[PDB]
């Protein structure tokens, strides 16, 4: 029982398109069948480094608890086309975020189904049960408004908004780049 907003899906596609050649990851925040109200990206390419992940998680927790949200999901898009299984990094990160709330489950952007319009739900949601992580039903509905997610993702990609998208790594490069990336949020609001 994992439910994410359409803005979460469009952010998924935006971050996947932003670094198509590099594996990416990030978190999904929700308020306390959990509904992921918002998302946040972090880093790309190399993902196994711990210090960045720790500093990230600390900042995510601070930002979310300051604004009443709590981190409740982890997303990861792998680099390889034929790769759709979690790595060690994804598994440990998902376990650690799920340590707080049991409703936290991992999601991975299956890049095999990554297309212009995102015809099929690219994200696959994995749950942690029996101390093992396994995928949910792919046939399940993932986004709240699938046609809306499709159209907004297509519009954003065709509008070259992926280049404008900023993740945590750009914030690391320079704080002047807003890591909260409300620009894509206002674009989503205008499109919707």
């Amino acid at each position: 029982g994992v439910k994410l907003t359409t803005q979460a899906y469009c952010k998924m596609v935006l971050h996947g398109a932003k670094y198509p050649h590099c594996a990416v990851n990030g978190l999904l925040v929700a308020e306390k069948h959990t509904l992921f109200v918002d998302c946040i990206p972090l880093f790309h390419g190399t993902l196994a480094l711990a210090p960045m992940l720790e500093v990230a998680l600390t900042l995510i927790d601070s930002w979310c608890k300051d604004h009443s949200y709590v981190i409740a999901g982890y997303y990861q898009a792998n680099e390889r086309v034929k790769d759709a299984s979690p790595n060690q990094v994804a598994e440990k990160v998902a376990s650690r975020i799920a340590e707080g709330f049991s409703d936290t489950a991992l999601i991975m952007v299956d890049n095999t189904k990554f297309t212009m319009d995102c015809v099929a739900p690219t994200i696959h949601v994995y749950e942690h049960h029996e101390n093992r992580w396994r995928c949910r039903d792919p046939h399940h509905d993932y986004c709240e408004d699938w046609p809306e997610a499709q159209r907004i993702s297509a519009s954003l990609l065709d509008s070259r908004s992926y280049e404008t998208l900023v993740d945590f790594d750009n914030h690391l490069d320079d704080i002047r780049n807003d890591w909260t990336n409300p620009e894509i949020n206002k674009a989503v609001l205008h499109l919707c």
Binding site: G16, A17, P20, H21, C22, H44, G45, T46, A77, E79, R80, V81, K82, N111, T112, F114, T115, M116, D169, D173
Partner: protein, 101 residues
């Protein structure tokens, strides 16, 4: 600015005119055969001024100096670039599938 370049040309041109003058003045001596043995002050002043201005233009033309500390140009080199390794490129990423094949 680029105008600096144009300047140096005129300097040589100025000098060139001086040369003509000098030649003519030499012809003057070669047609006067007097104990002058001195260039006109106007022409020498013109030559000196041309030398000065041309050198001044050259000073701009030389270019800009470069700092010795090797950590100068690498300050703005983010890690997102050095990791690309162009020789070791891989084309099994989501770029091909997402974009038009």
């Amino acid at each position: 600015p680029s105008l600096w370049k144009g300047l140096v040309g005129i300097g040589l041109f100025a000098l060139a005119h001086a040369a003509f003058s000098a030649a003519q003045h030499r012809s003057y001596m070669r047609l006067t055969e007097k104990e002058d043995e001195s260039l006109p002050i106007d022409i020498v002043l013109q030559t000196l001024l041309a030398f000065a201005v041309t050198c001044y233009g050259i000073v701009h033309i030389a270019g800009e100096f470069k700092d010795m500390d090797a950590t100068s140009e690498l300050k703005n080199k983010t890690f997102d670039t050095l990791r690309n390794h162009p020789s070791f490129y891989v084309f099994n990423h989501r770029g091909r599938v997402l974009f038009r094949p």
